[PDB]
């Protein structure tokens, strides 16, 4: 009863705190949902889905997967048609699947292939950029290609809070007596039956 | 109920504002839901189309589930391998008797 009451009260407090924390972080989820509907949509529906905000709700359309071997990244973000202007993210040419038209496009966040090449920013000296490319990053200087690099080449900082719960191990209780009943019987000086 | 009916613009999460100034350039394909009371109101091409309940919109959850159940009550009955009567009776002769 003692152990059960303590454990039940602690775990009920944990349950209440968990429910309140979920309800409390709903606000942060609303604001992030406004900031970038695609990512929060993908996290909340469990699958990569493009999203947009229709008033106070989310319109969602399933994204279509493309194998990595069908994507080629170009060299320089500088669009030659716009001197003094540059592409903010690297250009790509991708083919949906072999026996397809090589569709031109731009690399969008989290390995998105965006058909529209509208992301244009003024060019700036000191340009140094990393972008998600497949399983790793790609790195550019001065709006010019430098190299792809693995994920392990960048210092990893954690936003995760650590919690280390281990199970209570199995325990075996052996029989244990201070005196066996035979010792109790033999404790007598004279046995009448004997 | 008896005051002057004030015209304004709807806000976020059932806010009712006083100034009608949230003006965006018009666009084709306008389709919008808005929090209205206990449900949503749906507009198409900047015209009031109809209200609907929240149950009409599919629900995705941002909450992480955690299912804690209480350890139930348990009753321990008395239980002995041998009673005192059995221990005393295991003797072949009882001197007293």
């Amino acid at each position: 009863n003692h152990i059960q009451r303590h454990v039940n009260d602690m775990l009920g407090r944990i349950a209440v705190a968990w429910c309140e924390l979920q309800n409390h972080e709903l606000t942060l989820w609303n604001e992030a949902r406004k900031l970038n509907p695609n990512a929060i949509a993908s996290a909340t529906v469990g699958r990569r889905v493009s999203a947009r905000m229709l008033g106070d709700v989310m319109a969602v359309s399933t994204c279509v997967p493309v194998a990595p071997d069908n994507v080629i990244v170009q060299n320089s973000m500088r669009v030659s048609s716009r001197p003094g202007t540059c592409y903010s993210r690297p250009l790509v040419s991708f083919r949906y699947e072999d026996q397809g038209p090589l569709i031109e496009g731009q690399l969008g966040e989290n390995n998105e292939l965006r058909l529209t090449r509208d992301a244009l920013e003024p060019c700036t000296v000191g340009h140094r950029r990393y972008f998600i490319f497949g399983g790793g990053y790609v790195y550019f200087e001065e709006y010019a290609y430098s190299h792809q690099l693995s994920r392990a080449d960048v210092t990893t900082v954690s936003t995760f809070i650590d919690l280390n719960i281990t199970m209570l191990e199995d325990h075996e209780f052996v029989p244990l007596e201070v005196y066996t009943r035979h010792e109790i019987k033999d404790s007598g000086l004279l046995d009448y039956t004997e | 109920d008896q005051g002057p009916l004030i015209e304004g613009q709807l806000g976020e999460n059932n806010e009712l504002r006083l100034t009608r100034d949230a003006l965006e350039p018009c666009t084709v394909g306008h389709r919008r839901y808005f929090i209205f009371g206990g449900g949503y109101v749906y507009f198409e091409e900047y015209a009031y189309s109809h209200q609907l309940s929240r149950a009409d919109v599919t629900t995705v959850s941002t909450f992480i589930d955690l299912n804690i159940t209480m350890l139930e009550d348990h009753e321990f009955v008395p239980l002995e391998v041998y009673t005192r009567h059995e221990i005393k009776d295991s003797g072949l002769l009882d001197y007293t008797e």
Partner: peptide, 15 residues
Amino acid sequence: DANFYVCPPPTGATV
């Protein structure tokens, strides 16, 4: 994310 994705702009078919 080894696999790329093409994400057509959403319509209000699914909300």
